[PDB]
Design a protein around this ligand. Structure first.
Ligand SMILES: NC(=O)C1=CN([C@@H]2O[C@H](COP(=O)(O)OP(=O)(O)OC[C@H]3O[C@@H](n4cnc5c(N)ncnc54)[C@H](OP(=O)(O)O)[C@@H]3O)[C@@H](O)[C@H]2O)C=CC1
Lengths: 499, 499, 499, 499
């Protein structure tokens, strides 16, 4: 006997042992009489058009694939629920927090960032940790990473960062010059790069890592009062990492290591679960916060802003078909129910456009009609109609315009947004020089110990040594600008790596 | 008080007066708070991307249209049933014919041929009369017209024909030189053209014209014995035509005359209906048939092959949403249930491929998962997976390959095709010189009376006068080949029209 | 001999008489050996798959259509040039106005609003008068109508307005209840409805109407100083209109009357031309203007803001292929060169998004690479890469990220936008009760004479009579709010129309 | 300094040192003023819709991906030429073989089979070796593999096989049970499976492997006489393989090993080349041939049918943009110039439909208009019009219908297909028990030595051990049927692997 993942078909057959196999039909429901030999003239003659059995199957085979995700293509998925355990209704009116003991179905996707569909699981990368809540006020998508922070803090750079992290356009190979020529030209990546190359760059499967919302968000309660917030869901199975040595072995011994581990855990009743916390910053604490509280390369320190528990995330169910239920999942940060609102984070504002945009391409204009994407615990009612591959009654014969004197849906005034006052020139403000070193300096000195600083510098050198000298030189100076000894240790190792 | 169609909204409100109007949401279910004023910074300030409510709706407004049908774009639709009244189980084992009193749900779409989606309903043009039978053996599409014949008999001439009947590629105007340059060079059109320029060329709506499969099909019974057949469905409401003068007033008075007629008819209870007949020809009779029995420009005369009644087509239901239920209708002549099979009719062979092909472009790769197109009375199970906009469970975790030791669907041997023997060179055979005037001579002399012959030439002459003279000369010569009087009457009128 | 449009094929053949016809190939460049008969097994046999000639052509026939414009679908196109004749460089620095005599290639598309591709040209409807200027600084699309104003003044009402002007979602029929339930509920439409229902509702083709940009636009000069402006391009052929009687005869005698008129004119050297004016309003005059100076339902009176000539628009070239040059034409109001900027106009703000959004759907992601859409007077260079159907080098092996130390394209600082100061609450402001009657009162009394006021009410009553009584009452009341005698005349004619 | 691939960006800069950097625009050509900072209201304010620069780059970054290939997704590409070195004009009249010394431009793509876009190069799999000749008679796509044979010999089983070779639908894990449940039920895979688990299962890059057209094809000379042939192109660099122990290291040390090798060879002037041979079998030798001469699991032994050399394949140019020139590459076995024609091979026949079908889905309706797929050395001319993303003049104002009197393209009678006589019942013929072991017995005993048989059995058992026992026993039985020591060796190793 083997692990449960390997016995999938075995169990599938056992769970059907009594009933008879179904009839094999065409996509049109017509039974086929033989699907192992083609319609031909004589045993050694040519194929016929009449054989619509071959065409109908071959045609659909020819149309299996869709465009993989432009980032976070390698994914693992599982389903479960979220349960409220504490009371934060003084901050947010969101139904998903309405009372202790309330559950909501969730869907999760774990992913790497750079690799394509076929890439190994056990590499050095950040990890996608997206969560879809199916609430009654519509869906809520918390599309977070395993990091509170990110490498850049203005969306316009994002296509550039991702191009630098993916394949050279001519050679179609990973390029350390592209990787580091960007990172060293944009030292705002100092805070996140440090995180990446330390021990938690390679987590041991998806159950031994935290998730963060990273952005600052806005909560809104029943009085109309608003605060800013951070989301942290911390692993109840404990932070556990892989060594460089063991990550590289598994990278060829089991390219689907994290996928397997997740499925096997759920299958044997070993259910992973996370603890959702929030931080809270008042509007007037945001005015005096020493950094930009919406800077995505910054955290809120725990001494001044402690973690306030909210509930538990539990995954207890495996997908049944991976394509339908994991590959077609779409998470839109702009899916926010009343009570949860975006901050002015320059990076979050961009993701409000990008995700629904890319989802209309990747999946199809009516991608929200796909079951796993469908807000199936709310009533979708509005004045949008048509589009390719319409799948419900298309809202019936309801009046399709607004306003109207025929009682088609109405707006709900309690769901209006919180109103903030803003004043300033409409222009492009330079954010390349917000404090790029301070919170990193703290991380290097005060969070890491002696050994971890050693391994941090070795991991950086072990990937920066393939970049040209003028690129190495500038990166080292950036590291020097956090701590002299930081750059020194990397520069001592690069002197050796260069022979 | 007005005709029922004009009161559509009025009635949608009355049928609802007992409820409260719904809540107006986004596509993602989120309630809208204001959908008449945009989110801007100051009363006379600019628009924000934070206004996702605008973008959600506008993005779907921008994607409302799909490609119109490349032919038969202007159409009318309704639903009803087919009911068996006579026994033809000796010829066909199809379940749709199984016993007397058997009902089957049907969908119908009426259409013109050349006009695009905005054209007028009351114009000279054939009429499409497509019927879809939702049988337990899968769907059956009988895609027929209002005429038993077509203008051509090889599918390689079809795109040409359509282009000649549509707009000038540079001026975008209907071009008489294109219509008649083609018809005069291809005299095999003389038959259908004579039908087209007769009174029936302009039916008084869709309820007063007959339907025809036109093609020769094949019927297989339970013993494996096969006959050839034609399908006729005649109007129970009686043939009734518009005159050129009335047709031209309605064309601007009410461009949607045949849509309004079909709708108000069903709404006011006047259910239209048709009587389905078949002709039968034995394989032997096919070998001695003077003409080619698979030549789409020939009828089987009624003296030699009388009409055998089958059942009743009835339309008793109006669509609730036009787009969802009529514009997305896709009829595939290749959808054939066991007991019905195609003949070698060259024109039917080409339609076996073309319709599914254009449905994957017009509607999409999985258009069969659109409700009206779904074989919702059959159990569709096979090894076809994925594709854009996949909407069921994608057949779940079932094994997706055949053969397989895990009891996925199995082929049904009794659904194999009838075996016919063919012999000959694989080679493009010339069919342009099959008899092109005999059956047209009979029609002119023995079906039409004098008045009708008189009008036939005036309708022809009124359109052919716009073609250059050398085209005129050639078309007249084709008509003289049918009957010298037929040609010389046309020519007498052209002599006048040419001043 | 006939008119030039109908002799189009005759000339094509004449223009080629010297040379010999090309070889018939497949889409892959393979010569065919017969394209009139299909490859079959014997003369009466079935069709084969290895007839790739048939497949290659039919599959492309099957994909001829794309989506028609969601609005303004019926159109006619021509090309020519714009010539500067006066110096407005003190208001704008745009290269298209650089010096007197500077010409710029243009492309113009005329259209109606509500009809679909097959509808008639001579109907009551606004007209689209779009102009594309191919300047050195990129393309400038001036997407203008034949009115200075529009029915609404918020873009959130557009989908609704167009829904109410189009077909009933269940009967697919034009619905006078929708039309006037909307207009009566939204009286802001009083101004444009009064234009629509007067003589110029039906122009005598596209060579006898004026063009307008309707929206306020911003002009910026070389010093950085801004002003607000309107564009008027008046016809040098003279205003000329059709009567209700002649418009309706021509709606069935020549559905393509405006297209033929334009084509014939150009083909006979009678080139139509238009005179481009601007109005100018300073930022100070913008604060004291009696109404909102960005309200699309308002004009700037000539006495206070006179016309300032600019140049000529001239159409002297017919399209060679209508589909490739007129149906694939794409205008974007967001295509604006340095010198010309949008005003805060709530309607124009939304056209900034809607058009590129719809163009990616209707045509494709890279619709800007289609010839007629291409800024072929400019040099495109940036960091945008790939997409469906990429057709040039894709910009080669150039670095695809920014910033870079590898001499990829750079920004141009002198192309930065003008800076304006805005202040106020970010909220959705009500514009429903902007003065809806004052400028209409002036039109009714001071611009129309006794005869024209008569016909204006008659045209209104003819169409408003078909709507329910409660909608009539409301609409008349909106007309009495302009002038008692305005609502009176309409009510006396409706009294008659209701028997 | 480093290898040439890593210095791609360095060199691109050097090759431009003399010029100035371009100007960064939008896609419409409009210059940008800053592309590092987003347009916001105040330094810490929300993003605006007015920021079209952001939308135009993000909207295109959201649509970068296209569906990877359904098979052979991981690939490597170059360009070069084919040169005729011998005369085979007595067999084929094709213009690519016209005279000794004639050159044709070619395009090659190497590829694995099962892995997706991100998998490793150095795995056990067959290798694609597609070749596209740009002929004056239109493209010729010789789409070969690195083996003369395949696992199956009917196309209906192909989706199944592939499904069995890829990922479990539920676990998204490679499944050994699936692999060998298929392979053991279908022992016609014995032949190719023995090829795959031998040394040549893992070639040392794409330059040290042969290429085979595999299928039997037809040649036709100028007299209309025809023969059958096999295409073998053998590596001029010599066969070279990797050991299991080196392939697994490289699989995590350089997943793109073969991609880097190809580029580095060409970039350093070391151009790889192949020698094209053919075998020939007369129509009369095909009749007596002991096995089915169109069976894709069978080779033509060299003693009886010796290689005849034809020409050289040389690759001497790297792609400049990988996506445009390698990812968008499209081969069609159906692209065949006069002189070359398909054999009745059941597999090949299916491939005549599949490839254009999937290319329309993957790339788009007009994929042949992409530069790298264009037949840019023939003149394409026909009656196919329009489609999404229409790019040339759409063939201008030419008559779009056939036949016509206006001198639009004409068919070429010399380009008709060779005529073969076929006879038999139209039915589905069972080919599952054509000889499945003979040629495999010959390979095991006569081609492999002692060591190689040893490594063959070790390779097979190492992967079959993970399959259930009832699958093991069957597969072993299929191996005993080739040779008792074959299935007994494998059984000895499995006995140990099962502890
Ligand atoms: N006739 C053919 O086209 C081929 C036959 N074979 C095998 O050879 C057997 C006998 O044919 P015959 O022509 O009389 O034999 P020959 O001795 O004439 O030729 C044997 C062929 O086998 C190839 N070969 C050698 N080792 C391997 C391996 N590990 N994997 C794959 N191919 C290999 C060689 O290709 P190379 O020239 O590259 O060394 C050679 O062309 C067949 O049963 C068949 O399995 C294999 C390939 C082609």
């Amino acid at each position: 006997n083997r692990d449960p993942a390997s016995d999938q078909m075995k169990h599938w057959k056992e769970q059907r042992a009594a009933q008879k196999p179904d009839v094999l039909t065409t996509g049109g429901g017509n039974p086929v009489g033989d699907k192992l030999n083609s319609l031909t003239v004589g045993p050694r003659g040519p194929l016929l058009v009449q054989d619509v059995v071959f065409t109908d199957e071959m045609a659909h085979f020819d149309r299996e694939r869709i465009p993989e995700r432009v980032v976070h293509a390698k994914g693992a998925g599982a389903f479960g629920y979220f349960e409220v355990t504490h009371d934060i209704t003084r901050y947010s009116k969101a139904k998903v927090f309405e009372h202790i003991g309330k559950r909501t179905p969730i869907a999760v996707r774990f992913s790497t960032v750079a690799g394509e569909s076929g890439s190994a699981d056990t590499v050095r990368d950040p990890r996608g940790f997206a969560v879809k809540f199916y609430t009654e006020d519509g869906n809520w998508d918390l599309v977070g990473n395993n990091t509170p922070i990110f490498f850049i803090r203005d969306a316009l750079l994002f296509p550039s960062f991702i191009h630098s992290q993916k394949r050279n356009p001519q050679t179609h190979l990973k390029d350390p010059d592209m990787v580091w020529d960007f990172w060293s030209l944009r030292p705002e990546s100092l805070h996140q790069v440090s995180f990446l190359f330390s021990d938690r760059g390679i987590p041991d499967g998806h159950r031994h890592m935290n998730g963060y919302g990273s952005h600052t968000f806005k909560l809104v309660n029943a009085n109309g009062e608003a605060v800013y917030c951070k989301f942290h869901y911390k692993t109840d199975q404990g932070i556990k990492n892989l060594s460089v040595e063991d990550a590289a072995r598994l990278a060829h011994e089991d390219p689907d290591y994290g996928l397997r581990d997740l499925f096997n855990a759920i299958a044997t009743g070993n259910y992973p679960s996370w603890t959702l916390y929030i931080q809270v910053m008042t509007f007037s604490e945001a005015e005096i916060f020493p950094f930009n509280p919406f800077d995505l390369t910054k955290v809120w320190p725990h001494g001044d802003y402690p973690l306030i528990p909210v509930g538990k995330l539990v995954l207890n169910r495996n997908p049944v078909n991976y394509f339908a239920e994991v590959e077609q999942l779409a998470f839109d940060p702009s899916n926010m129910p009343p009570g949860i609102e975006p901050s002015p984070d320059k990076m979050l504002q961009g993701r409000l456009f990008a995700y629904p945009d890319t989802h209309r391409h990747r999946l199809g204009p009516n991608y929200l009609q796909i079951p796993v994407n469908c807000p199936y615990r709310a009533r979708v009612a509005n004045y949008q109609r048509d589009g390719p591959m319409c799948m419900m009654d298309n809202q019936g014969g309801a009046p399709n315009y607004y306003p109207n004197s025929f009682s088609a849906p109405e707006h709900q005034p309690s769901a209006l947004e919180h109103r903030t006052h803003f004043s300033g020139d409409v222009q492009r403000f330079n954010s390349a020089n917000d404090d790029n070193v301070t919170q990193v300096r703290t991380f290097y000195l005060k969070v890491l110990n002696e050994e971890q600083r050693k391994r941090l510098c070795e991991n950086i050198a072990g990937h920066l040594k393939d970049a040209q000298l003028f690129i190495q030189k500038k990166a080292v100076k950036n590291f020097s600008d956090v701590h002299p000894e930081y750059g020194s240790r990397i520069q001592a190792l690069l002197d050796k790596y260069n022979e």
